[PDB]
A paper describes a structure:
This directed the catalytic center of [name]/[name] to one of the non-H4 histone NTs. Representative writers of lysine acetylation (Kac) are E1A-binding protein [name] ([name]; KAT3B)8 and its homolog, [name] (KAT3A), which can transfer an acetyl group onto the NT lysine residue(s) for all four histones.
We determined the complex structures in which HAT is directed toward H3NT (p300H3-I·H4acNuc) or H2ANT (p300H2A·H4acNuc). In all complexes, as in p300H2B·H4acNuc, bromodomain of p300BRPH bound to H4K12ac of H4NTac, but the position of binding to the nucleosome was different for each. In p300H3-I·H4acNuc and p300H3-II·H4acNuc, it interacted with the minor groove at SHL + 1. Importantly, in all structures except p300H2B·H4acNuc, HAT of p300BRPH interacted with DNA through one or two basic patches. Along with that, another basic patch (KN basic patch) interacted with the linker DNA in p300H3-I·H4acNuc, suggesting an acetylation mechanism for H3NT that is less dependent on pre-acetylation of H4NT. This interaction mechanism explains why H3NT closest to the linker DNA is more likely to be acetylated indiscriminately. In p300H3-I·H4acNuc, the density of H3NT toward HAT could be modeled for the C-terminal residues after G33 (leftmost panel). Since the distance between the substrate-binding pocket of HAT and G33 is ~21 Å, p300BRPH of this complex is assumed to acetylate from the N-terminal side of H3 up to K23.
Numbering used by the authors:
A (entry chain H): 29 to 124
B (entry chain B): 23 to 102
C (entry chain A): 33 to 135
D (entry chain K): 1054 to 1206, 1232 to 1517, 1578 to 1601, 1611 to 1664
E (entry chain G): 14 to 118
F (entry chain D): 28 to 124
G (entry chain C): 12 to 118
H (entry chain F): 20 to 102
The structure:
DNA sequence: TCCGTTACCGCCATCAATATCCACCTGCAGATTCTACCAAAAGTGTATTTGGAAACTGCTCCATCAAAAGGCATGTTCAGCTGAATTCAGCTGAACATGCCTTTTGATGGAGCAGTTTCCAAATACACTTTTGGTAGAATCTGCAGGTGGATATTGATGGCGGT
DNA sequence: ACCGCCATCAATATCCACCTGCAGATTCTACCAAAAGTGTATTTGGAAACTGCTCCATCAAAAGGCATGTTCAGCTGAATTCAGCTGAACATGCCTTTTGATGGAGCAGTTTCCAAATACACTTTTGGTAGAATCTGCAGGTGGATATTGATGGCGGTAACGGA
């Protein structure tokens, strides 16, 4: 009715900002800017992964496709950090 | 009513001052007003089409944002 | 004879000061009521009896304000390139042409 | 009248939203301005004129034009200068100015423009010489006299503008502007005939016996006009007309030295008491569209061989004035240079060796010779006058007429003058006033002051005296003051081409009448 | 009993990313670890943006994040200059800049 | 037997559509590549706007309305309406027969 | 009927089942409407009609009976609508339109 | 084998003809190296996109399809080779 | 005695001639060697098909052709006939490729 | 022709009015904390199919050697020109004062916006049959490129008729 | 002797017509793997019908901005000149084209097999709307201390001048 689901990234962005800077605040608009930014980036990555996966007649999309999309969209200096962090995260997840 | 005189001389002068212009010619205003009108018409048509698609009689910032994103003019802040 | 000239500034001196003052400010510049009237009048052509929310009008105002600043910044380089100080319309026309929106 | 004047009214109507305040009669009760009837005595609008002309209540279109100008004047008088209604009325009047002219031209009239003369300066008895400036309050005296308010310790303002006169043709009966048709009562006492009536009957206007060419001729004027005609023929400009230069004044006078120099030198007997001279005045006329127009005039002072030293064998240019109406425009400077070079050559042939030029630009609102200079005629800068004189002198030297030209400082240094006695003395010159204000200290002060102003003054080196030209006594133009007063009193302005031509033909008529009563 | 975020040590709701991918209809079948990688990349990017915003705010003697600080942080980095080459920041203004030739003498 | 995989193209449809307007004008194989690339680009784009508007309306059913809106949004000027007309009449006759 | 296909039913030369199969295999959605392909085929055929019409006159005026990429480039560049629609499209063997400025002329 | 210095292979007549095709009347003698430097970033971007496409497919042969679909997303869609 | 055509008259000849031709003006062998050695940096022992190199050539040739008239109009804007690299920099920056 | 005299021009010096800077005080709303409450979402378990991978074999097409050559790349000389510096001459927006106005903020009356329930028409799936569109194979016809001859615009050089 | 404009002549380049050789376009013959139309059953999101409920649209005060009038000086445009620059032509020698042959790692097809996504059931938690209380950095207000532009004059440098 009046309390319909309107999930956002309000708590997550705040709690992430807590570690990097404890004595820092984000009043009203920074949340909207970051939400629009993350939505746009997610849309670009998902669309690129989808089209590149379709370009190979593959019915299953794995982390390799989205990784290729990230390397494609993000040039080398961010690409190496992205691939390193992704490999470390996936190895930690699989090991656990 | 013409409703095009709303862009006054001080307003356009102060807007041009942001670029570091020291001397402004006296006949720059007509063509920049025309450019503004033709640029706004393109997005107003898109917004009207988007609103008419949803069968809604009220326009929203959702239609404006996802009409501007197709022109390579993605806007941050009004997406939530 | 006579007494005059308390303090008179050289031409272009106040321009730098006002540019510096305005470059550190981020408030709006266009009045809301004339923009609302213009938007309503333009939208009258497409459909009649339409209601518009304030947030959409603010978004359109921001979008139209950013584009003019971008075009002015683009035309500044063209003007300085031609070894000229005054701004001429041909700068604006050629800046529009190079951007590819004239096609 | 309906079919001819309605295009202008429709053009006024379609100017949205300019004409909206004038579309309907003003209602003070429903507009918040109840005092309108107190300010405007005849409140009426466009719809009233439309109704009047639809019903044929106008005898002639002049009444319709007058009513339009009347509502424009009422709107201007009521609304303030910064009001939007004032701007609306102003631009509507401007548009009507271009819209009404073709209709009157096709209907057989001259023009449909409301033209008014310049505001005349008003004399006052506060200091016996005070002149009331334009748009100044004053106290009236039964409309026959006026007094200034500042020196005072009915009241009116100097905002009254004299309307242009009208003349009625003796055959068609139409009333039109006298200046536009260029009609004078003395020239044609039998009446005024419009061009349309003459064309219908294949008749021609009576030959003008008051033209400049019919004036008595002078040798100097003949030489000047011959040189101008030769130069123009060499140029061969298709738009060029016929230029006549004639000397109209030549009288002998004496200049009196001021008492300050009288005590220093005259009492000691080192210089003469007075210098005799002959003053000559000439004007230049060009025939444009079969009408004579004055476009150049000067006043000069020549010192004869019998003049006591150091004023021996010299000439001086007292004043210079002209109007920017010569055709072609590009050759006007060339024609002025040719006239000056011809005058210098004539005085050299007479024997004169030294020439003096004072390049003093006119002040704003002050006319040297031709009253009411056109607004489009920009006032030359002192630098501009110096450059023009330098170019004229270079051209004269190139013709082997002038040996050389210098500033006053270089001429004084070359002449090795020591005392102020050797300094040139002219009537109304700046140097006598400077010397009087100053009074070897005087010599040093004069040297410094004249070195400061050496750029303005120019000295020309050209190389008994007998003048073959007879004397022409004329008190109407004995000095620029009388000419200016006559032009102001008779509203003989030079603001427009038609007004300038009317002023020129009035001058020609006056000179012809005074020469032979 | 134990959430996937706790197992992977990631702050973002990795379950919500998987749920979005399921209803996003990008593919009829999706991998289990792909949403983890996508969330990690998004977290890295947003952490970069947040730390740059914090540095920009600290470079202005202020303890509050404002859109001007965001614009200054974005426009001072060439990677963000090219990456957000078509993105407009609200109330961000422009960078101060004056040409040398325009200076007198 | 062993044979290579087949390929798909719209050669016959293009060849037919050239005949009705210019029976005597010939077409070479070079321009078929450009034409196919252009038509595929148009198709994928218009499908993109159609699906995007469907997502905006959250409609689980894809129909003529969102592709109509995509045609209005994408093609600039009255040419869009042009296609609309024919498209409209097409679907109407597809409903009639 | 066993002989009247859907393509002939709508009076369109373009296929209607091929585009439907492409939409089904494109993974755009699990539900595909029946009325979309008939609308899309008409638009595609009509756009082909305009491109052919604009190529035909460019081919005729050159005293040529064979299609050349220059004719396609001329047809694209002389229309203010196609240029706006395809302003970011490069065509091989198309070239550029001749352009001589008045300033560069030896006046 | 790893060779180098092939940017000088773009002959002066080739660049002159390219400039003439663009309607240039007078050509300066110091812009050729500028163009050679400018082409570097475009060539690197194109090869990076193409090699990313090739490496994603686990193939050892580079095809024109990878190049054309890589140029499609850059805003330089090309017609003529299908797709 | 040589004809000695006046400067600027000859340019009309090739500006009229080249606009009527569309043949490639870049040699294939240096281009393929250049692309091979440039692409060798990312991966070694690569193999390229015949059509790939020509497709890349005809896709990269259009960029300069499309920039040429923009640079020409930029140079003419400065009341000059000669083109300068600053024109190219200005065009690239306004186009958004650089900034 | 050289030295004493003088006025003009310019370097640099303290200051006057204005602006910017920091320091202290005071009242206020958003951030922080705390409490309870409860429904959607996430955890495990079981069975099932299927998509990628293994080994094997056959088809393929690209680098390099090799040769004969005619046309274009490069060096050298000659000359016409067009951009940068100088000086001069006309003008419009910057910098003040003054009278007059309409932004901004303060509470309102009714038509769309949900909420809920039930029935309807199209979507999807399984099985049969005929058939149009790609294609291996082959034979046949023709418009287009090139060679050669002919006719016509176009341009520079030694003079020739007007102004200087 | 220069500068404009021009008739005449010899040499270039282009367009056109006639003729001939050839790769590409056109048409039978047929093909079984795959597509589509037809015949049934079933289910589910949306429309009709009723309701309660907010939010956009329409009037009133007082003073920091908004438009006019006046004056001017750095800014912009025009005429003149000179020397390093590139463009053209001729001679001489290297460089890409094409066709032939050969060797083998990469690619494609086939069968069977193993682990993971998915449809249900169950439960135990965790963040969002609600409330209240508390504090502290920040927007105005006032008060003194230095930095900046600039007209102006004391006096040195210097050029011009006149008598010896």
């Amino acid at each position: 009715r009046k309390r319909s689901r309107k999930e956002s990234y309000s708590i997550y962005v705040y709690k992430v900002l807590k570690q990097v800077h404890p004595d820092t605040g984000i009043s009203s608009k920074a949340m909207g800017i970051m939400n629009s930014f993350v939505n746009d980036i997610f849309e670009r990555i998902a669309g690129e992964a989808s089209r590149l996966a379709h370009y190979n007649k593959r019915s299953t999309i794995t982390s390799r496709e989205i990784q290729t999309a990230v390397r494609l969209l993000l040039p080398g200096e961010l690409a190496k950090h992205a691939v390193s962090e992704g490999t470390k995260a996936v190895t930690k997840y699989t090991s656990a | 009513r013409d409703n095009i005189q709303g862009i006054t001389k001080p307003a356009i002068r102060r807007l041009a001052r942001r670029g570091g212009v020291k001397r402004i010619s006296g006949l720059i205003y007509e063509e920049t007003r025309g450019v503004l009108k033709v640029f706004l018409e393109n997005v107003i048509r898109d917004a009207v089409t988007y609103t008419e698609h949803a069968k809604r009689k009220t326009v929203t910032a959702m239609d404006v944002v996802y009409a501007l994103k197709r022109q390579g003019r993605t806007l941050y802040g009004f997406g939530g | 004879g006579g007494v005059k000239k308390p303090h008179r500034y050289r031409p272009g001196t106040v321009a730098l000061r006002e540019i510096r003052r305005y470059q550190k400010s981020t408030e709006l510049l266009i009045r809301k009521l004339p923009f609302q009237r213009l938007v309503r009048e333009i939208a009258q052509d497409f459909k009649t009896d339409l209601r518009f929310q304030s947030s959409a009008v603010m978004a359109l105002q921001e979008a139209c304000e950013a584009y003019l600043v971008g075009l002015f910044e683009d035309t500044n380089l063209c003007a300085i390139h031609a070894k000229r100080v005054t701004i001429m319309p041909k700068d604006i026309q050629l800046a529009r042409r190079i951007r590819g929106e004239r096609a | 009248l309906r079919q001819a004047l309605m295009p202008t009214l429709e053009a006024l109507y379609r100017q949205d939203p300019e004409s909206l305040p004038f579309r309907q009669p003003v209602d003070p009760q429903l507009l918040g301005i109840p005092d309108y009837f107190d300010i405007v005595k005849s409140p009426m609008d466009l719809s009233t004129i439309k109704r009047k002309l639809d019903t044929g209540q106008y005898q002639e279109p002049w009444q319709y034009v007058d009513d339009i100008w009347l509502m424009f004047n009422n709107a201007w008088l009521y609304n303030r200068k910064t009001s939007r209604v004032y701007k609306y009325c102003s631009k509507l009047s401007e548009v009507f100015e271009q819209e009404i002219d073709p209709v009157m031209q096709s209907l057989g009239y001259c023009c449909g423009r409301k033209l008014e003369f310049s505001p005349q300066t008003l004399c006052c008895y506060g200091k016996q010489l005070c002149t009331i400036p334009r748009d100044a309050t004053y106290y009236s005296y039964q409309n026959r006299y006026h007094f200034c308010e500042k020196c005072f310790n009915s009241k009116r303002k100097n905002d009254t503008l004299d309307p242009e006169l009208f003349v009625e043709c003796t055959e068609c009966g139409r009333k039109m502007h006298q200046i536009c048709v260029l009609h004078h009562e003395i020239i044609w006492p039998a009446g005024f005939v419009c061009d349309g009536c003459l064309k219908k009957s294949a008749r021609t206007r009576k030959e003008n016996k008051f033209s400049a060419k019919r004036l008595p001729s002078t040798r100097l004027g003949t030489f000047l006009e011959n040189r101008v005609n030769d130069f123009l023929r060499r140029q061969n400009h298709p738009e060029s007309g016929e230029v006549t230069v004639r000397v109209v004044h030549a009288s002998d006078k004496t200049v009196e030295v001021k008492p300050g120099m009288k005590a220093r030198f005259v009492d000691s007997g080192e210089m003469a008491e007075s210098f005799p001279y002959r003053t000559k005045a000439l004007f230049a006329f060009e025939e444009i569209d079969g009408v004579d127009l004055c476009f150049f005039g000067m006043h000069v002072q020549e010192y004869g061989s019998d003049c006591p030293p150091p004023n021996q064998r010299r000439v001086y240019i007292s004043y210079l004035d002209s109007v920017h109406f010569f055709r072609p425009k590009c050759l006007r400077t060339a024609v002025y240079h040719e006239i000056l070079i011809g005058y210098l050559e004539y005085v050299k042939k007479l024997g004169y060796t030294t020439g003096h030029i004072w390049a003093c630009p006119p002040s704003e609102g002050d006319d040297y010779i031709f009253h009411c200079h056109p607004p489009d005629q920009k006032i030359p800068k002192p630098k501009r006058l110096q450059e023009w004189y330098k170019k004229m002198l270079d051209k004269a030297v190139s013709e082997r007429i002038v040996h050389d030209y210098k500033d006053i400082f270089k001429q004084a240094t070359e002449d090795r003058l020591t005392s102020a006695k050797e300094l040139p003395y002219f009537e109304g010159d700046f140097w006598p006033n400077v010397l009087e204000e100053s009074i070897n200290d005087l010599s040093q002060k004069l040297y410094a002051t004249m070195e400061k102003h050496k750029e303005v003054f120019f000295v020309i080196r050209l190389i008994p005296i007998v003048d073959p030209d007879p004397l022409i006594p004329c008190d109407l133009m004995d000095g620029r003051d009388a000419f200016l007063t006559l032009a102001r009193d008779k509203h003989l302005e030079f603001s427009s081409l038609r007004r300038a031509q009317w002023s020129t033909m009035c001058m020609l008529v006056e000179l012809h009448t005074q020469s032979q009563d | 009993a134990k959430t996937r975020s706790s197992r992977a040590g990631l702050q973002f709701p990795v379950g919500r990313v998987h749920r979005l991918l399921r209803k996003g209809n990008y593919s009829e079948r999706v991998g289990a670890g792909a949403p983890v990688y996508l969330a990690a990349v998004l977290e890295y990017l947003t952490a970069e943006i947040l730390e740059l915003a914090g540095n920009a705010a600290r470079d202005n003697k202020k303890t509050r994040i404002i859109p001007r600080h965001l614009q200054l942080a974005i426009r001072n980095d060439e990677e963000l200059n090219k990456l957000l080459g078509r993105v407009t920041i609200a109330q961000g203004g422009v960078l101060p800049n004056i040409q040398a030739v325009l200076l007198p003498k």
